[PDB]
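Predict structure. Chain length: 145.
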Amino acid sequence: AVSADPNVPNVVVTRLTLVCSTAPGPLELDLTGDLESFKKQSFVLKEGVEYRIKISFRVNREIVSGMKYIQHTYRKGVKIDKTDYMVGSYGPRAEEYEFLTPMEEAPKGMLARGSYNIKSRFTDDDRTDHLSWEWNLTIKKEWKD
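Prediction complete.
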């Protein structure tokens, strides 16, 4: 046999980047198969840093007009705030795309320092949900020192 039905998906979060003004670098997270490693590691940051998010996703099936990027800030198993970032429509033609969110200040404060489990659900207008994972955000005071 020379094939096993790879089930070519339409739109799925290929990778996740995180740039900033004083960060160590664009943290890249894997969102293809090895996702279990997310709960094993977190993202170190500083008290409420203004960082942007770059989502990447392949589109080789149909045009998904109405893509959305949600994210629930879960704390110790307790959702405290969640929002939906409208990405935009994307038609298949070559490879994935590179979305970009504005600088989002994280939670700051002496107690704000710690790991923050987040719930991101990659879906569209309403047809269905492309993919969703969970990663913790470890806040700090001088991650860039």
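Summary: Residues 1-145 form a domain with the Coagulation Factor XIII; Chain A, domain 1 fold (CATH 2.70.50.30).
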